[PDB]
Design an enzyme around this catalytic site. Structure first.
Site: not given
Ligand code: HEM
Ligand code: HEM
Lengths: 101, 49, 420, 55, 444, 220, 54
Positions: E60-61, E137
């Site tokens: 997703e990154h 994160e």
């Protein structure tokens, strides 16, 4: 009619709380409604009731009463709490009724 | 970080029916409770006597 | 179904907007010209408290029936407000409009602000205000309007501390009686037929005509307010007097906004189409964020940039954001950058109205500070009709005008307004 | 007053703070069982004793 | 004017057309100039294994850091310049990448999507950057109690299984995951039969499916390729996990029973039930007059800072429960009252309560289709989960059939006398004994 | 001191130079009384330009000498008195720091009258910067100052403070007659100039109360 | 706590019911029968025991 409108003045003197300098509303038994009602009284009416009451208590311990001059007169008795107490009960009855529905 | 946290293995203690990680424990639930509750109920009967 | 957007304008000046989109849900609202802007050093916060007071007893309905009654139909009821506008809206399924309406009408027109209810409520301002201030974002904005002005707009949006508990049923009443007047209010309403929303506004909306208290002109101060509080992250906002609502120069700034960059469009992505961002990026190495700030108020506005950054790097970061504004004020704007922005802006605008909320907001905003509805094609015609010059000029106006700065964090390495 | 009547009531509250919500070390052994026994034992004596005293 | 009943019927239908490679294309056409289209994939951490845990997240990154046909700078600039918004996510059983743009670019959008899911660049140099970022994160998310809590709830409610893992994965996995593993993950999971192209706004279904055929090519040869893998089932365990830290300001507690899973009709009743209990939070102005009993008590006795009910569903299972945030010394009373409300649900629900709960739930489902993205999210999900779209007109038919007698039977079946899963974080000394909590699972 | 003290030698950390900002900080807090202080870079310690200000201080007026009394010898006071009607207080503010100082006036007043009151205090400073100083006012002040100084040392406290202050930022003790010789050796000009330096320099203002009718630094 | 009349687990009980206990300033003689009843009780038990031993 103006019949029991006399009887009342009679009973009012019969009772005799006014000999203590107390208003009719001062002698109310403090149940739940009356307790909420008292929280709504304006600062000034509250402290006045307070002194009147504490005054009466001091007279009771002393076994005295107020000189006849200082007695609250039937027609000069302030129903200071009745207004609030009446609303507090309506509000309650509204809720009570609405929760059955 | 909390992502690095995992529950240890309770194999050493799990009951027979909830030993397999790929089988619904719900099917055997009524069994596991009905037994423990059966013991308890019995205790009452014995005490009531 | 698919048509119109009527908009009557009653005797007393009460505007009524409407549009039926046959959505399984309605969303009626009462927009008003009121806010911390009309507050005087004597009644500060009374706007804020009035906002939280929505659920208190009204002449028609009780504190109890309002909340119970609305929830009884899966309704809702909220109060959104800026420094100069207050909106009272309610949502619900199509078949419960008439019901939810009662409380709406009642709340906005017939409050009672009973002394006790009001006394018990005030301690809430302390809480309400506490969650808001959890985002530093909200702290510098308060202090900005305080350095950017000397009055009206300089008034804070959240009741100041010293005044919690000192507001009164009077102040609330007077505030309401002096501002919630038919000529300052608009009754918008998505999901309903115009005749119905009209009939309502009529026979019921009592508190009639007037314009009551008029806000004092927005003088500009140009002050600098700093807040040293230890936070590892420094927030800074430097602005200049920009355009005001309905200004010809407004569309110009809004564009210089997107050009400089205002908000990312790609998750965890870099913004190349953002000069301001890209500029600061080249400047520092550590994490940060920078954007084009732009506010448009009735008789004034604010424009500039806002930057978040590690304390030790707020220096290099803020400068960068500046140079990129001077560089842009000196023709550093391609004729294409003006094209891109114009798109980002039209898109942004058009997306911002898919929401039942966003739509009603849009419609009502006009119906109050105008009395009409600028077609979407017209607002588009107004936007691209902005020269490559208007932009560079906007930029200039900034590099020239007197700046006012607000910053909060470990400001040890943060520059003063006069070092930029 | 209080949510559950086990904490508000002037009496139950006493029963609760000494036989239900009372904090006890997680590791007390069997040697800590004699207190209750002593107590139970006492009730038993009194009960049987009265029954005997009536004759 | 028109009734709720009717406005519900005149809602444009949702078109669904499968391609040949197995991909499903669906959309709801509106009169809107703007729109949203994206691909909802049936992939997530649940599909991960012990060694690639967090790959789907690591992907997703990179999903946005450029494809092969057009590197980073190009990709971003191309998207930005058209005023389009690119976003997406990835949970335990579902990933998604979608875009918000003008109905005009609908086709160019579709090409970009297809280019992302099919052609991720996976630049060896980019991976060493997102690795550092992801690790950041993690440290951030670690400070968000509400999620540390729900993660822990899973980490135990489904201990020893796939659903027990966090979506972001482990530290080790992230420190070592490879271009290979990421590559593999993508080639293994991002596949037509397991994907759905959802679109909402002003778009021609036909124009969509057309642009679709053209960009989603990859045609399967063997049967294995167009077969949707069935996942091994996850076992629920009644148990607790207590992460104590008296140094934290407030405490978080979450309690739940095992859920039925997407397909079960009961999920409707369950949601109606959570509607009765509802949710609270110190800013709700309704205060002591809220209809939610737990909320009233919460208010009256200063029980908490907030609380929420939830019915998190999954393919074959789910979690039904609640989560509240309170001060160290009000944890017990809150838990007490809460469990109390559950017992009421099983034993004494009132038509009045369900009647209202249903109206709340309706406005809720409707509010989930307020915008193009939220209507697209629904489509992508419905297909993926129910194998089709369910119209509000339907939801409403089901929701209206629910009554007291019904709610009681369902709740009893899922809550009564069950051994729940408990997760507690913070200064939790006052909340105690699994035994005491387990006993709060019976007798009203 | 010797055979006992031990943390020693050098001057360690050195203070960063005193840069001047000239900001304006306002504090709205409801108080019926507004306090305000407007100043400009003053003089440093051990500076010649010091005495000059100290004198302009007493001239403008700083602190009453008569209980519940009015201060006529105070121009600043007297000026503001003529200005407002309600109670207030105004004085000459003066601070002398190692590498810098602060000078101006400080005023207390009812919120609604801080406007007229602060202006007054200003005009009385401009008026003084434009030769509005008698050669006698300079004489009076010089006395009030020498007296004040001399009285300020009767206290065991005040004395040690005086003695120590020098022994640290100097290493010597300026005889009382020398400090007196330094004080009256101040022309009627030095004073007016001091006043000028104020009306010219960049001002920084601090105010707190119901500032609703209080002026901003740029309105003076 | 400062004075042992409030801290001690026992005296504290004696104190909160016979020494620092809040009482209306105006209770009359009709409020004297409670204690009498109590005293009366201790007396019966005492004389009763003395009699039971014979
Ligand atoms: C702490 C509790 C008590 C203890 C330790 C206790 C102990 C004893 C003992 C050691 C005896 C001799 C029994 C025998 O060997 O014959 C006895 C007799 C007796 N006790 Fe108790 N006793 C207790 C309480 C009571 C009470 C409360 C009553 C009734 C008020 C009672 C009534 C009697 C009677 C009637 C006898 C004579 C009958 C007999 O010899 O069994 N006792 N008790
Ligand atoms: C509530 C307290 C008590 C009351 C109301 C009470 C009352 C009486 C009464 C009505 C009599 C009859 C006396 C007579 O006219 O002959 C009596 C007898 C007796 N009581 Fe009590 N009594 C009390 C407590 C006790 C106690 C605690 C004991 C000793 C444990 C006890 C031992 C006796 C004895 C030995 C007799 C028989 C001797 C006699 O007839 O005077 N009593 N009591």
């Amino acid at each position: 009619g103006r019949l029991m409108d006399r009887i009342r003045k009679w009973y009012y003197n019969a009772a005799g709380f006014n000999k203590y300098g107390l208003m009719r509303d001062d002698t109310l038994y403090e149940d739940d409604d009356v307790k909420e009602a008292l929280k709504r009284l304006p600062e000034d009416l509250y402290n006045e009731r307070m002194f009147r009451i504490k005054r009466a208590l001091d007279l009771s311990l002393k076994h005295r009463i107020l000189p006849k001059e200082q007695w609250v007169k039937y027609e000069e008795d302030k129903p200071y709490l009745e207004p609030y107490l009446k609303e507090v009960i309506r509000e309650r009855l509204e809720r009570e009724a609405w929760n059955k529905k | 970080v909390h992502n690095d946290v995992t529950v240890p293995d309770f194999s050493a203690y799990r009951r027979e029916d909830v030993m397999d990680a790929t089988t619904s424990s719900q099917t055997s639930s009524e069994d596991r409770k009905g037994f423990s509750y059966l013991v308890t109920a019995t205790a009452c009967v014995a005490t009531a006597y | 179904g698919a048509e119109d957007l009527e908009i009557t304008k009653l005797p007393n000046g009460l505007i009524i907007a409407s549009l039926e989109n046959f959505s399984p849900a309605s969303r009626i609202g009462v927009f008003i010209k009121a806010g911390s802007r009309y507050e005087t050093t004597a009644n500060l916060g009374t706007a804020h408290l009035l906002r939280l007071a929505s659920p208190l007893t009204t002449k028609g309905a009780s504190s109890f029936r309002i909340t119970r009654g609305i929830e009884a139909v899966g309704g809702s009821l909220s109060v959104y407000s800026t420094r100069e506008k207050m909106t009272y809206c309610v949502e619900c399924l199509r078949d419960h409009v008439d019901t939810v309406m009662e409380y709406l009408l009642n709340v906005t027109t017939a409050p009672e602000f009973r002394p006790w209810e009001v006394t018990d409520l005030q301690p809430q301002l302390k809480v309400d205000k506490a969650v808001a201030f959890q985002s530093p974002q909200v702290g510098v904005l308060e202090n900005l309007h305080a350095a950017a002005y000397k009055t009206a707009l300089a008034n804070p949006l959240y009741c100041p501390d010293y005044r919690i508990g000192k507001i009164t049923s009077e102040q609330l009443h007077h505030f309401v009686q002096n501002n919630f007047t038919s000529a300052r209010m608009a009754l918008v309403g998505i999901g309903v037929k115009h005749s119905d929303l009209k009939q309502v506004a009529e026979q019921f909306l009592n508190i009639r005509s007037g314009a009551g208290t008029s806000s004092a002109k927005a003088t500009y101060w140009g002050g600098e307010i700093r807040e040293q509080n230890g936070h590892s992250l420094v927030h800074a906002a430097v602005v200049t007097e920009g355009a005001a609502v309905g200004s010809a120069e407004a569309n110009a700034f809004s564009v210089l906004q997107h050009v400089l960059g205002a908000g990312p469009l790609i998750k965890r992505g870099s913004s190349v189409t953002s000069k301001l961002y890209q500029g600061v990026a080249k400047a520092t190495t550590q994490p940060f964020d920078a954007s084009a700030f732009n506010v448009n108020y009735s008789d004034s506005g604010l424009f500039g940039f806002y930057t978040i950054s590690q304390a030790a790097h707020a220096g290099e970061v803020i400068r960068a954001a500046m140079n990129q504004l001077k560089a842009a004020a000196q023709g550093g704007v391609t004729e294409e950058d003006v094209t891109k922005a114009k798109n980002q802006l039209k898109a942004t605008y058009l997306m911002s109205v898919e929401t039942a909320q966003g739509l009603l907001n849009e419609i009502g905003s006009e119906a109050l500070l105008s009395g009409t509805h600028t077609a979407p094609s017209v607002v588009a015609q107004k936007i691209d009709s902005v020269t490559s010059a208007d932009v560079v000029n906007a930029a200039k106006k900034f590099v020239s005008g007197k700046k006012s700065m607000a910053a909060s964090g470990d400001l040890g390495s943060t520059p003063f307004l006069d070092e930029l | 007053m209080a949510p559950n009547i086990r904490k508000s009531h002037p009496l139950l509250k006493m029963i609760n703070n000494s036989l239900i919500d009372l904090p006890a070390p997680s590791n007390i052994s069997a040697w800590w069982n004699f207190g209750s026994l002593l107590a139970v034992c006492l009730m038993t004596q009194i009960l049987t004793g009265l029954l005997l005293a009536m004759h | 004017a028109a009734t709720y009943a009717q406005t519900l019927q005149n809602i444009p239908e949702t078109n669904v057309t499968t391609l040949d490679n197995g991909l499903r294309v669906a959309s709801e056409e509106s009169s809107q100039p703007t729109c949203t289209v994206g691909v909802w994939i049936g992939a997530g951490s649940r599909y991960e294994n012990e060694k690639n845990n967090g790959a789907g997240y690591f992907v997703e990154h990179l999903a946005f850091k450029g494809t092969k046909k057009r590197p980073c700078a190009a990709f971003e600039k191309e998207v930005e310049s058209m005023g389009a918004h690119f976003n997406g996510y990835t949970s335990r059983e579902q990933t998604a990448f979608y875009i918000k743009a003008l109905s005009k670019d609908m086709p160019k959008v579709v090409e970009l999507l297809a280019d992302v899911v099919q052609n991720c660049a996976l630049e060896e140099s980019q991976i060493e950057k997102e690795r550092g970022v992801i690790l950041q994160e993690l440290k951030e998310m670690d400070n968000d109690m509400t999620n540390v809590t729900f993660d822990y709830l899973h980490a135990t409610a489904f201990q020893g299984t796939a659903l027990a893992r966090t979506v972001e994965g482990t530290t080790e996995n992230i420190k070592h995951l490879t271009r290979a593993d990421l590559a593999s993950y993508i080639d293994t999971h991002f596949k037509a039969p397991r994907m759905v192209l959802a679109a909402a706004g002003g778009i021609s279904h036909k124009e969509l499916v057309d642009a679709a055929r053209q960009h989603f090519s990859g045609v399967s040869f063997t049967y294995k390729e167009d077969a949707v893998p069935i996942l091994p089932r996850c076992r629920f365990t009644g148990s607790e996990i207590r992460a104590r830290d008296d140094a934290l300001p407030v405490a978080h507690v979450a309690l739940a029973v095992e859920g039925p899973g997407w397909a079960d009709p009961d999920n409707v009743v369950l949601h109606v039930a959570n509607a009765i209990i509802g949710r609270y939070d110190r800013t709700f102005g309704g205060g002591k007059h809220l209809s939610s009993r737990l909320a009233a008590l919460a208010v009256e006795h200063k029980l908490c800072h907030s609380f929420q009910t939830f019915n998190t569903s999954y393919s074959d299972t789910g979690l039904f429960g609640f989560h509240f945030v309170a001060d160290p010394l009000s944890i017990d009373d809150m838990m007490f009252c809460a469990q109390g409300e559950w017992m009421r649900l099983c034993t004494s629900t009132t038509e009045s309560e369900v009647k209202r709960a249903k109206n709340h739930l309706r406005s809720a489902m409707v509010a989930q289709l307020d915008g193009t993205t939220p209507v697209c999210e629904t489509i992508g999900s419905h297909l993926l989960n129910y194998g089709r779209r369910i119209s509000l007109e339907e939801w409403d038919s089901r929701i209206s059939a629910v009554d007291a007698r019904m709610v009681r039977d369902v709740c009893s079946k899922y809550i009564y006398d069950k051994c729940p899963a408990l997760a507690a974080v913070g200064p939790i000394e006052q909340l105690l004994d699994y035994n005491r909590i387990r006993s709060g699972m019976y007798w009203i």
